[PDB]
Amino acid sequence: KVGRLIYTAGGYFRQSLSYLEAYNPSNGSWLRLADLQVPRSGLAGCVVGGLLYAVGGRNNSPDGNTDSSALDCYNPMTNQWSPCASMSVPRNRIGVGVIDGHIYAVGGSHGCIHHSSVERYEPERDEWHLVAPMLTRRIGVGVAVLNRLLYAVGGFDGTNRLNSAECYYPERNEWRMITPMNTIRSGAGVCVLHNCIYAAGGYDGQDQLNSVERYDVETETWTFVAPMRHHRSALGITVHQGKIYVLGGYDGHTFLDSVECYDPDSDTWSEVTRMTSGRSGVGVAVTMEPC
Numbered sequence: 001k002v003g004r005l006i007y008t009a010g011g012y013f014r015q016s017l018s019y020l021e022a023y024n025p026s027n028g029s030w031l032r033l034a035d036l037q038v039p040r041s042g043l044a045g046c047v048v049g050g051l052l053y054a055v056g057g058r059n060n061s062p063d064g065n066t067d068s069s070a071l072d073c074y075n076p077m078t079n080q081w082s083p084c085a086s087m088s089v090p091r092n093r094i095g096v097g098v099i100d101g102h103i104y105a106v107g108g109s110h111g112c113i114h115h116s117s118v119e120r121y122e123p124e125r126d127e128w129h130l131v132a133p134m135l136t137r138r139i140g141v142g143v144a145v146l147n148r149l150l151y152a153v154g155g156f157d158g159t160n161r162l163n164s165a166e167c168y169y170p171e172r173n174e175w176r177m178i179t180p181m182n183t184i185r186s187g188a189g190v191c192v193l194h195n196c197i198y199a200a201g202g203y204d205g206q207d208q209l210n211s212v213e214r215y216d217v218e219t220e221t222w223t224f225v226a227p228m229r230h231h232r233s234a235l236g237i238t239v240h241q242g243k244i245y246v247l248g249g250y251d252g253h254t255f256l257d258s259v260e261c262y263d264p265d266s267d268t269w270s271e272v273t274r275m276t277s278g279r280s281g282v283g284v285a286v287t288m289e290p291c
């Protein structure tokens with residue numbers, strides 16, 4: 001369990017960013033590591049077999065905007081990024097979940113297309129394959145895995161921001177709707193802690209949110225928990241040592257450098273550190289420290 005860092009990749013401030021930085025919750029330290037080959041915001045991060053994966057996003061630059069189908073893998077042992085097989089389609093504002101060593105890429109946009117499509121990556125074969133699409137097109141979708149089931153939460157379908165959510169059952173290759181959230185949320189941070197799927201922040205169509213709600217898979221209910229100290233949309237999120245960490249985002253005025261930590265035992269959020277600069281739209285994941 002020791003020696004794990006919170007990695008933040010990419011993001012957005014004025015333009016899409018190539019930063020890879022790692023935070024050590026045990027000593028407060030930040031490390032700047034190998035840049036992404038291509039700056040990207042709206043990407044997702046995940047970890048399989050100790051490798052950090054950056055999936056999709058968009059390169060926003062003064063010389064254009066390209067939605068990304070890329071899957072790039074970072075090895076902390078080498079501090080090197082390597083290209084992996086690309087997805088079938090570009091996916092900006094994607095969500096990602098891992099089940100049994102496989103990466104699921106969910107939704108996202110390509111130009112004006114809002115995807116319902118979903119695809120699954122097999123590291124052992126370096127191949128992607130499409131699976132059943134969601135019941136709703138979703139960009140800015142939050143994705144988490146609980147009990148080897150994949151959840152897609154909120155987002156924007158091209159016309160409406162969503163409070164709906166749905167669950168993918170891999171052995172049936174089938175999506176089913178679940179209880180909708182109490183709040184419409186696009187660009188929320190979604191993760192799993194204990195038996196619950198948490199949805200923190202986001203945009204409801206009018207304001208950035210500091211509210212946080214959690215879905216109990218047993219009771220099929222969403223319940224609000226303590227709100228964040230800051231309103232945040234397009235925030236990064238991960239879980240580390242039984243706590244939720246939220247990184248950055250946009251509060252309606254500033255791109256935040258704040259990192260907050262939620263303790264479920266006290267139902268409190270605390271400010272724990274600041275990123276090296278404010279940004280939104282980052283990919284976040286946890287893996288061993290580099291060398």
Ligand SMILES: Cc1cc2c(cc1[C@@H](CC(=O)O)c1ccc3ccc(OCC(=O)NC4CCCCCC4)cc3c1)OCO2
Nearest residue numbers: 012041042093139140156186187202203233234250280281
């Ligand atoms: C969440 C959101 C907030 C907004 C908004 C549009 C959205 C949605 C889309 C929607 O509701 O159609 C959204 C959802 C998920 C995202 C995930 C990543 C992501 O990275 C690129 C990025 O970081 N851009 C930033 C520039 C400043 C304003 C836009 C949002 C932040 C963007 C995301 C955007 O318009 C202004 O506030």
Ligand SMILES: [Cl-]
Nearest residue numbers: 041042058092
């Ligand atoms: Cl964008």
